[PDB]
């Protein structure tokens, strides 16, 4: 990792992260078989089997009763794209013609490939285990509705086989048909691995996804199609991470305030967050929660990306003179804060606040000068502002400093209005 401090605007850019971009959805359609449970009844009072049978029947019927601020824009587009893609395909499976086709596909074997009438191709999977137990064993055990049989082995076994079924209902019931993530129970490990291996992407991507399936699991979601006969039918949307190992970088910023004749003038960069370059264009990912890191890899959703002109990188080099309208916020009152970075921390420290850096060998090393300063994780273990304490990221790397007198000190601020929120820099300085 290479981290450059940009003292021209009190910002850091950390390069060398490797992209993992979602570029599609994959659909597996599951049938979960719960057998002829609704026929079974108990004539002989409370018992182990009656309680588990009651839970199964209750859970089964319960399903039938069921169903510019770039950071704001992008996350709306992202979730809209996700939900519509899921509902649009679910609405195509929900027809009775197709449910019979899926059941006809899976009738002999546990995995099948189906083309819906809407032209999409899906994998299909049968979770058949519970029907097999209810039909082949439990139904003959309960002769003549006598449920309180002497053999406990049926009762303990039944609690195991229905365990998965009850968990699926629990997740859908709490989420009104669209779950937030692919639980352990909607799709097992073996089912997930065998699903990913069929995705429409080359082996390089798939090998990564298999070694990282906890992230694939986290970003997908499931949709309930419904209960048909005594089979639960649900579908899972899996993220196709179709592009990997492109360059990415993160931008951080802090208030670049500086003072003349006793009056502060401030600037803060509003273009913070993730950027990734892909096939010769730059994508900006402003949502606070749609990129996540695991080492050098950053996982991001292409639907949350806003395209930016490639010249936009000039705000990281010579913002004082680029013609690209670099987004900044301007103001008169300085804020003191610590903006942490992967390899260090920006300390903004202004009037009436005391700031100092420390270590685990010795508690205090120095007290900082006023103004924006870059504290390096090799030079301190902790940094503190006004009795607050922060821990620096201990990861090794290399740091650079790009010298240049700060923008807020070089120009004179516009007399009215100050306090402009999210405007281009030309609108604040050299009026």
């Amino acid at each position: 990792l290479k981290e450059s401090y940009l003292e021209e605007s009190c910002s850091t850019i950390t390069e060398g992260y490797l992209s993992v971009l979602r570029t599609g959805w994959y659909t597996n359609v599951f049938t979960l078989e719960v057998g002829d449970v609704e026929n079974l009844t108990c004539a002989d009072g409370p018992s182990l089997i009656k309680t588990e049978l009651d839970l199964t029947k209750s859970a089964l019927r319960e399903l039938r009763t069921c169903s510019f601020v770039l950071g704001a824009i992008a996350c709306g587009v992202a979730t809209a794209a996700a939900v519509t893609a899921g509902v649009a395909i679910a609405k195509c499976i929900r027809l009775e013609s197709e449910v019979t086709a899926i059941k006809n596909c899976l009738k002999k074997t546990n995995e099948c490939v189906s083309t819906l009438g809407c032209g999409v191709r899906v994998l299909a999977t049968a979770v058949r285990e519970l029907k097999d137990f209810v039909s082949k064993n439990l139904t003959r055990a309960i002769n003549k509705n006598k449920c309180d049989i002497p053999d406990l082995k049926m009762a303990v076994s039944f609690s195991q086989f229905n365990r998965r079924f009850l968990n699926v209902v629990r997740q859908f019931s709490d989420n009104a048909g669209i779950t937030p993530a692919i639980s352990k129970d909607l799709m097992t490990d073996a089912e997930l691995a065998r699903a990913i291996s069929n995705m429409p992407t080359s082996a390089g991507q798939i090998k990564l996804m298999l070694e990282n399936r906890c992230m694939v699991r986290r970003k997908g979601f499931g949709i309930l199609i419904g209960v048909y006969g005594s089979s639960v039918i649900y579908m899972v949307q899996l993220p196709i991470f179709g592009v990997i190992d492109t360059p990415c970088w993160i931008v951080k910023a802090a208030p670049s305030c500086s003072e003349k004749k006793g009056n502060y003038a401030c600037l803060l960069r509003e273009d913070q967050g993730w950027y990734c370059q892909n096939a010769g264009s730059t994508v900006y990912y402003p949502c606070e929660k749609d990129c996540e890191t695991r080492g050098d890899h950053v996982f991001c959703d292409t639907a949350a990306g806003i395209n930016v002109a490639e010249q936009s990188k000039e705000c990281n080099i010579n913002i004082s003179t680029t013609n690209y309208p670099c987004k900044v916020s301007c103001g008169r009152h300085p804020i003191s804060m610590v903006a942490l970075s992967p390899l260090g921390a920006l300390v903004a420290c202004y009037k009436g606040v005391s700031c100092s850096i420390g270590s685990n060998r010795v508690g205090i090393i120095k007290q900082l000068n006023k103004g924006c300063s870059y504290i390096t994780n090799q030079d301190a273990d902790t940094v503190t502002i006004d009795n607050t304490v922060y821990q620096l990221s201990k990861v090794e790397g290399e740091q650079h400093v790009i010298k240049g007198r700060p923008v807020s000190s070089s120009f004179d601020p516009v007399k009215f209005p100050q306090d402009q929120f999210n405007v281009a820099l030309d609108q604040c300085f050299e009026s």
Partner: antibody, heavy 121, light 106 residues
Framework: LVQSGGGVVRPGTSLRVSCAAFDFNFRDYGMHWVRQAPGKGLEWVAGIWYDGSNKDYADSVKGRFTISRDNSQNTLYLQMNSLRVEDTAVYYC?????????????????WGQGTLVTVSS | ELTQDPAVSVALGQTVRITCQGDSLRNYFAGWYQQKPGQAPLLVLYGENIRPSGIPDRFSGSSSGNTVSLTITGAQAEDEADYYCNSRDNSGNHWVFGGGTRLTVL
């Protein structure tokens, strides 16, 4: 799989080896032909996608064989012309698992029983 | 073009790794078949260590770089067969089979 059409002919003639009576739904699956000369290793012969597009062939046959399918009767055909002596082999009918043609999978399953085609003087 | 060792032997109950080598395995997964004499090939492994249902849990796969290998744990006498790898070439259209390994169990 009721595979037929396999016998013996003098070289320079034509024959057809059909593979039908599929237990799975023959539609929606891609299909492939693989052959095995007596005692020798396997050779891929031809391929077809589920809608009948993407007919493709190994260079040993690129000019001569044709691979065809009927999704209404559930039958797969490989029709041989200018049959040459080296074409003597067991022909197997095999299934393609892939959902999407861009996928990375490259195995076959559901191998049929063999259909021995012989060529002799 | 895929490539294989022509023959390999294993002591009963000892393990053995068959290996298949070819430039295209970087992009496309392999499928592993076994062929006992006369019978049609039977898929024994595919992908990165996925078994078809019914294949006993002794077979396991591994891969790296441009190489794949099939590991037979606890090699039983019924494991004596030809083993063939196949994969697509860099065209993405043409399949290729390895020359097959005639494993034998002592």
């Amino acid at each position: 799989l009721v595979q037929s059409g396999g016998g013996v002919v003098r070289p320079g003639t034509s024959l057809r080896v059909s593979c039908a009576a599929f237990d799975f739904n023959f539609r929606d699956y891609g299909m492939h032909w693989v052959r095995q000369a007596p005692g020798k290793g396997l050779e891929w012969v031809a391929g077809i996608w589920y809608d009948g597009s993407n007919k493709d062939y190994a260079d040993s046959v690129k000019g001569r064989f044709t691979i065809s399918r009927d999704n209404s009767q559930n039958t797969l055909y490989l029709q041989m012309n200018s049959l040459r002596v080296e074409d003597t082999a067991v022909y197997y009918c095999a299934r393609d698992p892939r959902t999407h043609r861009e996928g990375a999978l490259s195995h076959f399953d559901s191998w049929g029983q063999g259909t021995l085609v012989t060529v002799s003087s | 073009e895929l490539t294989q060792d022509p023959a390999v032997s294993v002591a009963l109950g000892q393990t053995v790794r068959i290996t298949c080598q070819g430039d295209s395995l970087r992009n496309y997964f392999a499928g592993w078949y076994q062929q006992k004499p006369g019978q049609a090939p039977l898929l024994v492994l595919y992908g990165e260590n996925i078994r078809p249902s019914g294949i006993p849990d002794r077979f396991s796969g591994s891969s790296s770089g441009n190489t794949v290998s099939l590991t037979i744990t606890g090699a039983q006498a019924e494991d004596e067969a030809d083993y063939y790898c196949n994969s697509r070439d860099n065209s993405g259209n043409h399949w290729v089979f390895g020359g097959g390994t005639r494993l034998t169990v002592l």
